[PDB]
Coordinates of all heavy atoms in Angstrom, one line a residue:
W551 N 63.8 40.8 92.3 CA 63.0 41.3 93.4 C 62.5 42.7 93.1 O 61.3 43.0 93.0 CB 63.9 41.2 94.6 CG 63.2 41.7 95.8 CD1 63.7 42.6 96.7 CD2 61.9 41.4 96.3 NE1 62.8 42.9 97.7 CE2 61.7 42.1 97.5 CE3 60.9 40.5 95.9 CZ2 60.5 42.0 98.2 CZ3 59.7 40.4 96.6 CH2 59.5 41.2 97.8
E552 N 63.5 43.6 92.9 CA 63.1 45.1 92.6 C 62.2 45.1 91.4 O 61.3 45.9 91.3 CB 64.5 45.8 92.4 CG 65.1 46.0 93.8 CD 66.5 46.7 93.5 OE1 66.5 47.9 93.5 OE2 67.5 46.0 93.4
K553 N 62.5 44.3 90.4 CA 61.6 44.4 89.2 C 60.2 43.9 89.6 O 59.2 44.5 89.2 CB 62.2 43.4 88.1 CG 61.8 43.8 86.7 CD 62.6 43.0 85.7 CE 61.7 42.1 84.9 NZ 62.5 41.5 83.8
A554 N 60.1 42.9 90.3 CA 58.8 42.4 90.8 C 58.1 43.6 91.4 O 56.9 43.9 91.1 CB 59.1 41.3 91.9
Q555 N 58.8 44.4 92.3 CA 58.1 45.6 92.9 C 57.7 46.5 91.7 O 56.6 47.0 91.7 CB 59.3 46.2 93.7 CG 59.6 45.3 94.9 CD 60.9 45.8 95.5 OE1 61.1 47.0 95.8 NE2 61.9 45.0 95.8
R556 N 58.6 46.7 90.8 CA 58.3 47.6 89.6 C 57.0 47.1 88.9 O 56.2 47.9 88.4 CB 59.5 47.4 88.7 CG 59.8 48.7 88.0 CD 61.3 48.8 87.5 NE 61.4 50.0 86.7 CZ 62.3 50.9 87.0 NH1 63.5 50.7 86.6 NH2 62.0 51.9 87.7
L557 N 56.8 45.8 88.8 CA 55.5 45.3 88.2 C 54.3 45.5 89.0 O 53.2 45.1 88.7 CB 55.7 43.8 88.1 CG 56.3 43.5 86.7 CD1 57.8 43.5 86.7 CD2 55.8 42.1 86.3
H558 N 54.4 46.2 90.2 CA 53.3 46.5 91.1 C 52.7 45.2 91.6 O 51.5 45.0 91.8 CB 52.2 47.2 90.2 CG 52.8 48.5 89.7 ND1 52.6 49.7 90.3 CD2 53.6 48.8 88.6 CE1 53.2 50.7 89.6 NE2 53.8 50.1 88.5
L559 N 53.5 44.2 92.0 CA 53.0 42.9 92.5 C 52.4 43.2 93.9 O 52.8 44.1 94.6 CB 54.2 42.0 92.7 CG 54.7 41.5 91.3 CD1 55.9 40.6 91.6 CD2 53.6 40.6 90.7
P560 N 51.4 42.4 94.3 CA 50.7 42.5 95.6 C 51.7 42.1 96.7 O 52.7 41.4 96.4 CB 49.5 41.6 95.5 CG 49.9 40.6 94.4 CD 50.8 41.3 93.5
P561 N 51.5 42.4 97.9 CA 52.4 42.0 99.0 C 52.5 40.5 99.1 O 53.5 40.0 99.5 CB 51.7 42.7 100.2 CG 50.3 42.9 99.8 CD 50.3 43.2 98.4
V562 N 51.4 39.8 98.8 CA 51.5 38.3 98.8 C 52.5 37.8 97.8 O 53.4 37.0 98.1 CB 50.1 37.8 98.6 CG1 49.7 37.9 97.1 CG2 50.0 36.3 99.0
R563 N 52.4 38.2 96.6 CA 53.3 37.7 95.5 C 54.7 38.2 95.8 O 55.7 37.5 95.6 CB 52.8 38.3 94.2 CG 52.2 37.2 93.3 CD 52.4 37.6 91.9 NE 51.4 38.7 91.6 CZ 50.2 38.4 91.2 NH1 49.3 38.0 92.0 NH2 49.9 38.7 89.9
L564 N 54.8 39.4 96.4 CA 56.2 39.9 96.7 C 56.7 39.1 97.9 O 57.9 38.7 98.0 CB 56.0 41.3 97.1 CG 55.7 42.2 95.9 CD1 54.9 43.4 96.3 CD2 57.0 42.5 95.1
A565 N 55.9 38.7 98.9 CA 56.3 37.9 100.0 C 56.7 36.5 99.5 O 57.8 36.0 99.7 CB 55.1 37.8 101.0
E566 N 55.8 35.9 98.8 CA 56.1 34.5 98.2 C 57.4 34.7 97.3 O 58.3 33.9 97.4 CB 54.9 34.2 97.3 CG 53.8 33.4 98.1 CD 53.1 32.5 97.2 OE1 53.6 31.5 96.8 OE2 51.9 32.8 96.8
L567 N 57.4 35.7 96.5 CA 58.6 35.9 95.6 C 59.9 36.0 96.5 O 60.8 35.3 96.2 CB 58.3 37.3 94.9 CG 59.5 37.8 94.2 CD1 59.9 36.9 93.0 CD2 59.2 39.2 93.7
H568 N 59.8 36.9 97.5 CA 61.1 37.0 98.3 C 61.5 35.6 98.8 O 62.6 35.2 98.8 CB 60.7 37.9 99.5 CG 61.9 38.6 100.0 ND1 62.7 38.0 101.1 CD2 62.5 39.7 99.7 CE1 63.7 38.9 101.3 NE2 63.6 39.9 100.5
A569 N 60.5 34.8 99.3 CA 60.9 33.4 99.7 C 61.5 32.6 98.6 O 62.6 32.0 98.8 CB 59.5 32.8 100.1
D570 N 61.0 32.6 97.4 CA 61.6 31.9 96.3 C 62.9 32.6 95.9 O 63.9 31.9 95.6 CB 60.6 32.1 95.1 CG 59.4 31.2 95.4 OD1 58.9 31.0 96.5 OD2 58.9 30.6 94.4
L571 N 63.0 33.9 96.0 CA 64.3 34.5 95.7 C 65.3 34.2 96.8 O 66.5 34.0 96.6 CB 64.0 36.0 95.7 CG 63.1 36.4 94.5 CD1 62.8 37.9 94.5 CD2 63.8 36.0 93.2
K572 N 64.9 34.1 98.0 CA 65.8 33.7 99.1 C 66.3 32.2 98.9 O 67.4 31.9 98.9 CB 65.0 33.8 100.4 CG 64.8 35.3 100.8 CD 66.0 36.1 100.5 CE 67.2 35.7 101.5 NZ 68.2 36.8 101.3
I573 N 65.3 31.3 98.7 CA 65.7 29.9 98.4 C 66.6 29.9 97.2 O 67.6 29.3 97.2 CB 64.4 29.2 98.2 CG1 63.5 29.1 99.4 CG2 64.7 27.8 97.7 CD1 64.4 28.6 100.6
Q574 N 66.2 30.6 96.2 CA 67.1 30.7 94.9 C 68.4 31.3 95.3 O 69.4 30.8 94.8 CB 66.3 31.5 93.9 CG 67.0 31.6 92.6 CD 67.2 30.2 92.1 OE1 66.5 29.3 92.4 NE2 68.2 30.0 91.2
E575 N 68.4 32.3 96.1 CA 69.7 32.9 96.5 C 70.6 31.9 97.2 O 71.7 31.6 96.8 CB 69.3 34.0 97.5 CG 70.5 34.9 97.8 CD 70.6 35.1 99.3 OE1 70.0 36.0 99.8 OE2 71.4 34.3 99.9
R576 N 70.1 31.3 98.3 CA 70.9 30.3 99.1 C 71.3 29.2 98.1 O 72.5 28.8 98.1 CB 70.0 29.8 100.2 CG 70.8 28.9 101.1 CD 69.9 28.4 102.2 NE 69.2 27.1 101.7 CZ 68.4 26.4 102.4 NH1 68.9 25.5 103.2 NH2 67.2 26.6 102.4
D577 N 70.4 28.6 97.4 CA 70.7 27.6 96.4 C 71.7 28.1 95.4 O 72.6 27.3 95.0 CB 69.4 27.2 95.7 CG 68.8 26.0 96.4 OD1 68.1 26.1 97.4 OD2 69.0 24.9 95.9
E578 N 71.6 29.3 94.9 CA 72.6 29.8 93.9 C 74.0 30.0 94.6 O 74.9 29.6 93.9 CB 72.0 31.1 93.5 CG 71.0 30.9 92.3 CD 71.4 31.9 91.2 OE1 72.5 32.0 90.8 OE2 70.4 32.4 90.6
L579 N 74.1 30.5 95.8 CA 75.4 30.6 96.4 C 75.9 29.2 96.7 O 77.0 28.8 96.3 CB 75.3 31.4 97.7 CG 74.4 32.6 97.5 CD1 73.4 32.6 98.7 CD2 75.2 33.9 97.6
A580 N 75.1 28.4 97.4 CA 75.5 27.0 97.7 C 75.9 26.3 96.4 O 76.9 25.6 96.3 CB 74.3 26.4 98.4

């Protein structure tokens, strides 16, 4: 996530990214 920010991603890709990182996070802990 922080790297995505470092790449200067737009707020949409960062929002979509956060969703995928959240799903990946929950799936990764689960």
Side-chain angles (χ1 to χ4, degrees):
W551 177 229
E552 284 180 88
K553 204 169 118 172
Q555 292 167 51
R556 216 156 172 126
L557 264 90
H558 300 263
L559 285 176
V562 75
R563 249 208 291 264
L564 290 157
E566 269 209 76
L567 169 67
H568 207 269
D570 285 41
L571 294 180
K572 287 320 293 190
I573 292 311
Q574 184 55 24
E575 188 229 276
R576 188 179 86 176
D577 262 83
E578 273 229 46
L579 318 132

